Structures are given as structure tokens and as C-alpha cells.
């Protein structure tokens, strides 16, 4: 039942950020500046369904 | 060959900010609020050509 999650703010719904944080991908995958800008977009698509 | 540059982040391309930084214009021009807002926009328009 337990899991980590970004608390609900006033500007966005629930955010998962469960495991393998998306920040560590830049170092280990060596993305260009084009792929880097896409990380925040896919960050906000991790919504929890009930 | 050498020149100053804002490092290419994950959400934006190379930014020049070569000389005479834009924030120094506030003191030496006394711009109003309708022109201080434009400064970030023209800051992001200094893309390096290759």
C-alpha cells in the first residue's frame, strides 16, 4: 500500500515519481538539449488513476 | 574563439548573453513595467547560429 509521491499542490494533480527518478537519466543516458526539454513534459503525465 | 554562454539546459538551447547584460539596462534607462517584462523574451531570442 505504501509508495512515494509528490503532494497535491494548488497548480497540479497527484504526481507519482515512484522509482528511478527522471533526473538521473541525464547523466547515465547523455541526452541532448532537445531530449532534456521533454523530461518535464513526461513528468506531468504520471497521474494516478483510481 | 572563446565567448561567454549560458549552458544548454534540458529545456532550452544555447543562450548568448555575451556582453552588456540586460539587467544593467534597468538602472541606465529607467524602463517602466511594460518594458521590464519584455527583457526575458529577448533574452531567449539570442540563439547561436552554426
Amino acid at each position: 500500500t505504501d509508495y512515494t509521491r509528490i503532494a497535491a499542490s494548488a497548480l497540479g494533480p497527484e504526481i507519482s515519481t515512484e522509482g528511478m527518478p527522471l533526473f538521473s537519466l541525464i547523466e547515465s543516458l547523455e541526452l541532448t538539449e532537445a531530449e532534456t526539454s521533454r523530461l518535464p513534459v513526461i513528468q506531468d503525465s504520471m497521474v494516478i488513476q483510481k
Side-chain angles (χ1 to χ4, degrees), chain A:
Chain A
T1 186
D2 318 326
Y3 70 100
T4 172
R5 150 212 50 80
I6 272 178
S9 67
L11 70 145
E14 286 191 0
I15 291 306
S16 95
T17 167
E18 173 24 42
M20 183 143 104
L22 291 173
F23 195 79
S24 183
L25 290 203
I26 280 169
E27 295 279 323
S28 63
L29 274 179
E30 201 193 4
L31 311 163
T32 88
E33 48 59 27
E35 278 104 10
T36 301
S37 74
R38 303 229 302 272
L39 283 193
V41 163
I42 78 184
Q43 179 68 57
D44 319 335
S45 100
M46 311 175 98
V47 290
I48 298 94
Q49 327 265 4
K50 306 201 310 134

